[PDB]
């Protein structure tokens, strides 16, 4: 006995416009390939290869750049120069 009112006359929704003809034949193999590649993260897992890449590019490589950047900080002063003069500071 609880129904939305008899005074609605609600209809269908169109988006409106022109049916453009198909300029592309979709390939099922390429479509499911790309749908597998974009949503790759929902099925990614940790293996030995994944862990090796994550150990290098997230941990070891920022640490190597950190060693190089914080050690060689105010060494070089190549502004003028001469012969026999100090090229570094430390």
């Amino acid at each position: 006995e609880l129904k939305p009112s008899s005074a609605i006359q609600r209809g269908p929704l169109n988006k409106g416009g022109w049916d453009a003809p198909h300029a592309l034949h979709n390939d099922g193999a390429i479509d499911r390939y790309a749908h597998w590649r974009t949503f790759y993260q929902e099925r990614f897992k940790y293996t030995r290869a994944t862990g090796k890449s994550t150990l290098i590019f997230l941990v070891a490589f920022p640490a190597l750049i950190g060693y190089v950047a914080y050690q060689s900080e105010g060494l070089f002063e190549f502004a003028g120069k001469r012969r026999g003069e100090s090229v570094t500071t430390r």
Partner: protein, 90 residues
């Protein structure tokens, strides 16, 4: 009409009035461009010394070449925040 506004130091100008602070900033800045045009003028003279000398540029303007390599670390833009934020001898 080539206007010449006055020079205001940062020393004893009471950094609570924005008039003298901003003039001190602009004055240290504009004098720094003047300090640079000497570098840009000796470079223009050194190239004419070279192009007229030809082979004996090694001994004609050894003084201008060493002059240019002396000005080069110490005539460039350097910042008003280095001298405004810090005081020497304190």
């Amino acid at each position: 009409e080539h206007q010449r506004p006055e020079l205001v130091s940062f020393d004893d100008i009471n950094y609570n009035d924005h008039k003298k602070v901003r003039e001190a900033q602009e004055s240290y800045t504009r004098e720094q461009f003047i300090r640079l045009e000497a570098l840009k003028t000796v470079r223009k003279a050194l190239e004419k010394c070279y192009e007229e000398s030809g082979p004996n540029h090694f001994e004609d303007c050894k003084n201008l070449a060493e002059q240019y390599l002396d000005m080069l670390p110490t005539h460039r833009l350097q910042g008003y925040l280095g001298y405004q934020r810090n005081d020497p001898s304190k």
